Design a protein around this nucleic acid. Structure first.
Ligand SMILES: *OP(=O)(O)OC[C@H]1O[C@@H](n2cnc3c(N)ncnc32)[C@H](O)[C@@H]1O
Ligand SMILES: [Cl-]
Ligand code: NA
Length: 644
DNA sequence: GCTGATGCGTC
DNA sequence: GTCCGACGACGCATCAGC
């Protein structure tokens, strides 16, 4: 029999044979080390096509040898516990994980924390650290389905003392780990596999696997490589077609618990016949590409007529009305938000004509002040409870701004152009001020009308504009293009938006792609009255890899053992390295917000809270400035008042 | 019963 | 352009520690 040790499993080898090259036997549970070895081969390469090939080899072996393990292997590859709408959560972050690592090795938690920060990867700590769990019975090798089941066991532990019970399971995994298993167990619990391969590449690998090695054959499979009889050109075309069948099905039913059973019993070619868009099952939403100006919009939408719509500052609400009366509401990430919006559920009868029997709406839920009849900031919206049984205790009302209709009266509109979907939205749904209204829109290609419309959207409490084609490539087919829309935010344009010069007072050690480097920095404004620097926000995006390496080498020279007495951070995360205040950086943000932690400008707007920056990003170093020329706290308060 | 640290999801 | 993973503020919900 095939007695290959999984430590030598090589799913990246040439001429991979699903049966003979697997490190397990027919009917045997897929070993977790097989998955870990696949992860190693994937993280070693940078070309997605190579990663997809390697994963597909693993999946073809699972299909051929252990079909029941396909679903857990996929979820482990995605680092997910299940369908997003089920709401499974590990309840385990770096905190609980590092505590588990410490106990499993007898080390002090702070020593474990320090090492993980230096290496920028908890997996390398769990890998290299030495276990202290002296067991008198060598544990059996971990299996993929067993590890996945233990992860779901962790997620189900709730209530007081549950943290210790979660840690006991985690420790049980580590003691059974061999070779590279501990590294990826810890990374999975940390939420940072660092594969370079995610949903789109996992789907590509899955469609390729079940296409090359069809499921459901008598063992041993007579057809183990269905591409051997095709030319390279025909093989590529065939695999891309099969890949699109799976992609467009998944974007309408992003639920592996539903797809994989059908895939194993009926095959991929027949997948659309057994899995289709239906109210009650969330679908992948259409996303938007950032655009830096009106001119770039025209260039992208040359010839194609398009519409402009207010980009409201709320939360996406995918509203499902099932045939029968049941209503469900999903987030942009397919999370179930139904229990969050009892006021919307009781509102659905008002928004539709008697002929509407089912639908899927794409809306933005925006906080709404019914007394003033005005949109309220996104920050107010986030104060709503996550579960509210009684709509009578809601304190922050919401107004739905609908902008798309994806499903209507039992028929999918995914293949209809926006012009038609928008017309069906207007013809079948009813507006009520402050409760359910159509997104404010403008149909034009005049640059001056758009710039004016953009200016009004901001005055009307919006982030800018969304731009969408009406008839050319204007469908709702996410598998063809997920970012089919354009977003034109104020803070994208040149010379527009809040720009601040802030002092770098601390650095945080980078993780993953930032390991061995500084991944983030602590910034401060200058409080002129007290001659102190006040932390305002952290910063971790906007610089190239080259800039980020120069910052590391230059700021290293400013590392202090202890903070300066005139630097105030209060509730901010203590930096891994305090920095002698010197470097001044130009930073752009979308908005200023009242912060629960940052002291910057405390007392100039509110007695207790300071001010922070929404979506800050690095622009450039101000080498012509010292800390005393940084943006002052008083200026921060002025910007905040001018904003509100 | 209270508070602050942790987890996770929203943008 | 796609895909991916670095990184942000802040809120509710949860739970350990007191
Ligand atoms: O910045 P981003 O890419 O998340 O923006 C997209 C999101 O913007 C919200 N939104 C608000 N108003 C609209 C309209 N009218 N059309 C499309 N999207 C809109 C959504 O929440 C969206 O995901
Ligand atoms: Cl400069
Ligand atoms: Na959510």
């Amino acid at each position: 029999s095939n007695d290959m040790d999984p430590s030598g499993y090589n799913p990246a080898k040439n001429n991979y044979h699903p049966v003979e090259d697997a490190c397990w036997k027919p009917g045997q549970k897929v070993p977790y080390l097989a998955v870990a070895r696949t992860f190693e081969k994937i993280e070693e390469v940078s070309a997605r096509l190579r990663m997809v090939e390697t994963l597909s080899n693993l999946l073809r072996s699972v299909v051929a040898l252990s079909p029941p393990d396909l679903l857990p292997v996929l979820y482990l590859s995605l680092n997910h516990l299940g369908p997003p709408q089920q709401g499974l959560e590990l309840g385990v972050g770096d905190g609980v994980l590092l505590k588990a690592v410490a106990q499993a090795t007898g080390r002090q938690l702070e020593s474990v924390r320090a090492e993980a920060a230096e290496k920028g990867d908890v997996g390398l700590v769990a890998e290299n650290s030495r276990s202290t769990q002296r067991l008198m019975l060598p544990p059996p090798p971990l299996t993929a389905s067993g590890v996945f089941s233990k992860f779901r066991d962790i997620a189900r532990l709730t209530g007081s003392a549950s943290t210790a019970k979660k840690i006991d399971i985690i420790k049980g995994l580590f003691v059974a780990c061999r070779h590279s298993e501990a590294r990826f167990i810890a990374r999975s619990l940390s939420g940072r596999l660092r594969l370079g391969l995610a949903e789109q590449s996992v789907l590509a690998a899955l469609s390729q696997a079940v296409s090359l090695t069809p499921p459901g054959q008598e063992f041993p499979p007579a057809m183990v490589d269905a591409g051997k009889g095709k030319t390279a050109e025909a093989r590529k075309t065939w695999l891309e077609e099969q890949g699109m069948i799976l992609k467009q099905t998944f974007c309408e039913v992003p639920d592996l618990d539903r797809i994989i059973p059908v895939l194993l019993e009926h095959g991929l070619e027949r997948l659309p016949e057994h899995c289709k868009l239906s109210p009650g099952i969330p679908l992948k939403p259409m996303l938007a590409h950032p655009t830096r100006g009106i001119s770039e919009v025209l260039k992208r939408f040359e010839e194609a007529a398009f519409t402009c719509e207010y980009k409201y500052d709320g939360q996406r609400a995918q509203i499902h009305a099932l045939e029968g009366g049941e209503v469900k509401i999903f987030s942009r990430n397919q999370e179930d938000n139904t229990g969050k919006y009892p006021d919307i559920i009781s509102r659905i009868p008002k928004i539709k004509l008697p002929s509407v029997t089912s639908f899927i709406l794409d809306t933005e839920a925006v906080a709404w002040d019914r007394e003033k009849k005005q949109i309220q900031p996104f920050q107010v919206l986030t104060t709503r409870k996550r579960k509210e049984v009684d709509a009578s205790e809601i304190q922050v009302q919401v107004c739905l701004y609908a902008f798309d209709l994806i499903y209507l009266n039992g028929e999918s509109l995914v293949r209809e152009p926006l012009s038609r979907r928008r017309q069906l939205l207007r013809e079948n749904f009813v507006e009520t001020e402050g409760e359910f209204v159509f997104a404010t829109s403008l149909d034009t290609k005049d640059i001056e009308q758009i710039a004016e419309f953009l200016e009004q959207s901001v005055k009307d409490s919006c982030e800018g504009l969304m731009v969408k084609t009406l008839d050319v490539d204007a469908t709702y087919e996410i598998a063809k293009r997920s970012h089919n829309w354009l977003k034109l935010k104020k803070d994208y344009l040149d010379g527009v938006g809040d720009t601040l010069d802030l002092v770098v007072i601390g650095a945080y050690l980078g993780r993953g792609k930032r390991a061995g480097r500084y991944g983030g920095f602590l910034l401060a404004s200058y409080d002129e009255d007290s001659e102190e620097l006040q932390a305002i926000c952290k910063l971790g995006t906007g610089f190239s890899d080259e800039e980020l390496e120069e910052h590391h080498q230059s700021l290293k020279a400013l590392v202090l053992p202890s903070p300066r007495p005139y630097v105030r951070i209060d509730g901010a995360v203590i930096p891994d390295h305090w920095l002698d205040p010197s470097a001044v950086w130009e930073v752009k943000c979308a908005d200023l917000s009242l912060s629960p932690i940052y002291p910057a400008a405390r007392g100039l707007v509110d007695s207790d809270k300071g001010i922070s920056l929404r979506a800050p990003r690095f622009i450039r170093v101000r080498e012509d400035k010292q800390p005393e020329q940084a943006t002052t706290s008083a200026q921060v308060a002025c910007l905040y008042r001018k904003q509100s």
